[PDB]
Amino acid sequence: FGNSRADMEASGGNSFNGKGGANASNTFSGTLTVTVDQVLANGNLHVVGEKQIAINQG
Amino acid sequence: FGNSRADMEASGGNSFNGKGGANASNTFSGTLTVTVDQVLANGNLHVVGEKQIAINQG
């Protein structure tokens, strides 16, 4: 063990970090009167409707 | 492992961020008297109406 022939010193490290995410949303509020355009074979009603507004520019 | 022939050091990164949205709205308030211009085959009434105002310039 003379002349520092056995001394030793070492270090080491390692790291990792990952992450992620996502989201989505939507809302809707109002009232609209539609019209029946077809009566299906089991009594259900197919309905369609449209409302058009024009306030001063568009 | 002499002469730093095995030392090592590395880094790395990565990032991403996206987003978006939209919205719409409309209101309307008032009173207007319209006139029946047709009676449909099931009793419904087709109505039309117009009101014209002219306050001092337009």
Distance CA A46, CA A6 (A): 89
Distances (CA, A) of B12 to A14, A43, B36: 12, 63, 74
Experimental technique used? cryo-EM
CB of A55 within 8 Å of a chain B CB? The answer is yes
Give the burial class of A17: count Cβ atoms within 10 A of its Cβ; 0-12 exposed, 13-18 middle, 19 or more buried: exposed
Residue with tokens 């002219």: B54
Residue with tokens 């001092």: B56
Nearest-Cα distance to chain A for B26, in Å, is 9
Cβ proximity of B12 and B3 under 8 Å: no
CB of A53 within 8 Å of a chain B CB? The answer is yes
Distance CA A56, CA B5 (A): 77
Q: List, as one string, the DSSP characters of A1-58.
A: -GGGSS----------------------------EEEEE-TTS-EEEE-------S--
Nearest-Cα distance to chain B for A20, in Å, is 9
- The resolution, in Å, is 2.8
Cβ proximity of A36 and A49 under 8 Å: no
